[PDB]
Write an enzyme that holds these catalytic residues in place. Sequence first.
Site, PDB file in Angstrom:
ATOM      1  N   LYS A 297      -6.290   0.954 -25.976  1.00 22.11           N
ATOM      2  CA  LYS A 297      -5.829   1.103 -27.360  1.00 22.11           C
ATOM      3  C   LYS A 297      -6.686   2.071 -28.098  1.00 22.11           C
ATOM      4  O   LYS A 297      -7.922   2.336 -27.759  1.00 22.11           O
ATOM      5  CB  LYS A 297      -5.790  -0.250 -28.041  1.00 22.11           C
ATOM      6  CG  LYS A 297      -7.019  -0.949 -28.121  1.00 22.11           C
ATOM      7  CD  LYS A 297      -7.714  -0.630 -29.436  1.00 22.11           C
ATOM      8  CE  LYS A 297      -8.387  -1.925 -30.001  1.00 22.11           C
ATOM      9  NZ  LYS A 297      -9.467  -1.323 -30.780  1.00 22.11           N
TER      10      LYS A 297
ATOM     11  N   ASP B  24      -9.889  -8.508 -28.880  1.00 19.42           N
ATOM     12  CA  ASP B  24      -8.850  -7.468 -28.500  1.00 19.42           C
ATOM     13  C   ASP B  24      -7.854  -7.868 -27.429  1.00 19.42           C
ATOM     14  O   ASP B  24      -6.887  -7.129 -27.160  1.00 19.42           O
ATOM     15  CB  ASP B  24      -9.394  -6.038 -28.208  1.00 19.42           C
ATOM     16  CG  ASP B  24     -10.202  -5.474 -29.403  1.00 19.42           C
ATOM     17  OD1 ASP B  24      -9.627  -5.434 -30.507  1.00 19.42           O
ATOM     18  OD2 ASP B  24     -11.373  -5.123 -29.169  1.00 19.42           O
TER      19      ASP B  24
HETATM   20  N1  LIG Z   1     -12.943  -5.737 -16.628  1.00 21.23           N
HETATM   21  C1  LIG Z   1     -13.987  -5.970 -17.739  1.00 21.23           C
HETATM   22  N2  LIG Z   1     -14.348  -7.182 -18.480  1.00 21.23           N
HETATM   23  C2  LIG Z   1     -15.235  -7.488 -19.554  1.00 21.23           C
HETATM   24  N3  LIG Z   1     -16.068  -6.610 -19.985  1.00 21.23           N
HETATM   25  C3  LIG Z   1     -15.957  -5.349 -19.436  1.00 21.23           C
HETATM   26  C4  LIG Z   1     -14.960  -4.949 -18.327  1.00 21.23           C
HETATM   27  N4  LIG Z   1     -15.175  -3.622 -18.149  1.00 21.23           N
HETATM   28  C5  LIG Z   1     -16.180  -3.234 -19.023  1.00 21.23           C
HETATM   29  N5  LIG Z   1     -16.659  -4.260 -19.795  1.00 21.23           N
HETATM   30  C6  LIG Z   1     -17.768  -4.297 -20.849  1.00 21.23           C
HETATM   31  O1  LIG Z   1     -17.519  -3.683 -22.157  1.00 21.23           O
HETATM   32  C7  LIG Z   1     -18.317  -2.467 -22.271  1.00 21.23           C
HETATM   33  C8  LIG Z   1     -17.474  -1.307 -21.656  1.00 21.23           C
HETATM   34  O2  LIG Z   1     -16.175  -1.124 -22.349  1.00 21.23           O
HETATM   35  P1  LIG Z   1     -14.614  -1.228 -21.770  1.00 21.23           P
HETATM   36  O3  LIG Z   1     -14.324  -2.788 -21.767  1.00 21.23           O
HETATM   37  O4  LIG Z   1     -14.784  -0.315 -20.597  1.00 21.23           O
HETATM   38  O5  LIG Z   1     -13.753  -0.586 -22.998  1.00 21.23           O
HETATM   39  P2  LIG Z   1     -14.705  -0.797 -24.282  1.00 21.23           P
HETATM   40  O6  LIG Z   1     -15.746   0.383 -24.331  1.00 21.23           O
HETATM   41  O7  LIG Z   1     -15.342  -2.183 -24.133  1.00 21.23           O
HETATM   42  N6  LIG Z   1     -13.835  -0.913 -25.730  1.00 21.23           N
HETATM   43  P3  LIG Z   1     -13.939  -2.146 -27.017  1.00 21.23           P
HETATM   44  O8  LIG Z   1     -13.328  -3.488 -26.487  1.00 21.23           O
HETATM   45  O9  LIG Z   1     -13.030  -1.507 -28.076  1.00 21.23           O
HETATM   46  O10 LIG Z   1     -15.433  -2.268 -27.391  1.00 21.23           O
HETATM   47  C9  LIG Z   1     -19.598  -2.783 -21.461  1.00 21.23           C
HETATM   48  O11 LIG Z   1     -20.666  -3.464 -22.175  1.00 21.23           O
HETATM   49  C10 LIG Z   1     -19.022  -3.605 -20.283  1.00 21.23           C
HETATM   50  O12 LIG Z   1     -19.910  -4.511 -19.606  1.00 21.23           O
END
Ligand SMILES: Nc1ncnc2c1ncn2[C@@H]1O[C@H](COP(=O)(O)OP(=O)(O)NP(=O)(O)O)[C@@H](O)[C@H]1O
Length: 296
Positions: A9, A136
């Site tokens: 998103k 989210d």
């Molecule tokens: N499948 C997954 N599950 C949970 N956490 C995750 C996962 N992948 C990455 N992360 C965590 O969230 C951060 C990386 O972001 P990602 O989830 O890749 O999109 P995002 O950067 O989190 N966007 P936002 O949710 O808007 O903050 C890091 O601190 C990760 O450890």
Amino acid sequence: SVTVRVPGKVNLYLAVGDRREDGYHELTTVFHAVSLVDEVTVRNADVLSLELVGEGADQLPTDERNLAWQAAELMAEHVGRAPDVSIMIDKSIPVAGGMAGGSADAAAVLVAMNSLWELNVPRRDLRMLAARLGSDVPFALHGGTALGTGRGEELATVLSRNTFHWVLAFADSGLLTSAVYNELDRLREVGDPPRLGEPGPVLAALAAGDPDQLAPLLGNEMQAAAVSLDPALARALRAGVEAGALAGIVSGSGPTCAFLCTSASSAIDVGAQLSGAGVCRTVRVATGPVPGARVV
Ligand SMILES: Nc1ncnc2c1ncn2[C@@H]1O[C@H](COP(=O)(O)OP(=O)(O)NP(=O)(O)O)[C@@H](O)[C@H]1O
């Protein structure tokens, strides 16, 4: 085996309420799902396991720190079952790129398990689990575009007459959401940073499918605070526009800069110019809205 596709998103609009306590800001956001996606494949297994593949996937936990793992635990507990599934995630939502990829994967796990175990629990029950998981996840189930008013309340669906064309650019380093809110609080004490329009005009532009109308209405109250901390973001947003984008904003606390273009052709050209010019680590084209988590 069931595979679910789920999008990342971008926030088209984000108004952030004045700090109250314990230091909370009420958020009003327009969420827009775009065509950078993960695909999550779930099969029955002897024990819960999780693996991820794709750029940046090696940075991510494969245990209970991963929201997708927590999703499998919650969905199974909800139907009194053990989470005896293997989960494989083909990740193409940029990692740490601010597009809520862990939340998209959690939403996809809910939907994939619902289909795999042939349970077909209603969507309301999935939204309920998604809220427990994190702020989210609900939107990743919902998809499309939606206006969100606050912590619990239903998202409101916004339909568009045509698709929008985006260039999304990711800085080589994200900011802690914590720090950005602090600098936002401080800029407001010391001065008067940009305060957004109302979100109705944004929804009217989206409904109209009109990117020339949408462009000057995109906004993010956290942007000033991001740009204060990393001024490079200011030149990046200008570069994207110099490249031919109509407008560019930072999404969330970053690192996504989102650039709205007039057409798919234009986005390709804007994307090429931006990639060439090295202001960002990663440059990608996308379209929105796209649907939320769905079996494919
Ligand atoms: N499948 C997954 N599950 C949970 N956490 C995750 C996962 N992948 C990455 N992360 C965590 O969230 C951060 C990386 O972001 P990602 O989830 O890749 O999109 P995002 O950067 O989190 N966007 P936002 O949710 O808007 O903050 C890091 O601190 C990760 O450890």
